[PDB]
Ligand SMILES: CC[C@@H]1C(=O)N(C)c2cnc(Nc3ccc(C(=O)NC4CCN(C)CC4)cc3OC)nc2N1C1CCCC1
């Protein structure tokens with residue numbers, strides 16, 4: 001991994017770590033819409049994303065640069081902001097995890 005992608009990998013490891021789990025857990029794995037009874041989820045969300053998919057993409061060297069990684073993490077949060085009412089607990093969790101992400105992403109070496 002390039003130096004910028006090492007930083008992205010560090011962020012990802014942090015987002016998956018036990019100290020953020022109280023608000024990160026909804027983002028760990030792909031939404032199982034049928035299991036949750038959300039039969040409109042895949043009509044509304046065209047491009048699902050979650051942290052385990054980001055991790056697999058990192059491991060497989062799919063991301064060619066930090067921008068492509070950031071776009072996927074942000075897509076995950078946007079899906080949450082699109083599907084759920086803005087006062088939902090899951091949205092509050094997203095906002096908190098996105099705060100973790102954006103502040104550390106901004107420290108990217110360059
Ligand atoms: C996809 C919509 C939105 C979102 O954006 N993401 C990312 C999401 C990701 N993961 C979840 N996951 C779970 C969400 C609720 C429950 C749950 O409450 N289960 C009960 C627990 C106690 N038991 C006696 C009966 C069942 C379990 C979940 O997975 C473990 N929910 C998400 N939500 C929420 C889904 C509907 C409201 C918002």
Ligand SMILES: [Cl-]
Pocket residue numbers: 070071074
């Ligand atoms: Cl972006």
